[PDB]
Design a binder for these strands. Sequence first.
RNA 1: AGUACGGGACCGGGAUGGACAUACCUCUGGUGUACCAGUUGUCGUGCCAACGGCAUAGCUGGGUAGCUAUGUGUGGAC
Length: 77
Amino acid sequence: VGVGYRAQMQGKPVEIKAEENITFSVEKNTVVKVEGISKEQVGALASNIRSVRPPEPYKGKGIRYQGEYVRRKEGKT
RNA sequence: AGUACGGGACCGGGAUGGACAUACCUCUGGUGUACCAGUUGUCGUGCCAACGGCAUAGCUGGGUAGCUAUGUGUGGAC
């Protein structure tokens, strides 16, 4: 899902290192297909770009393959 | 955008603090018994003075150099 949501603070006697709260400038947000010859390297990059946003249990928001489980909880550590 | 989530998130990134460590005396202070000034009692040079001796440095108000913190800098990042 292409949205860009990432943390919260609003805005993008001293601030925590100048400015804060920066998400990501949506450029693609469409079904991406990696084209390679080495399965090993292909898998690494594929999972490397799949770690950007781990499939959340809320509505499966984030790069993933197909697996997904509905949920809405994070109150106990 | 205070949008998700249903009040309040992890994300790169100038500087303000607390405690502690270290260096120094320009500044604010402290001390400064061979520096300057004011003043009480008594003794000594015929009288009075000036000055000297003793009284915690006689007492009181300031204070140079030096040594100092509560004073002035820097650090702990990457």
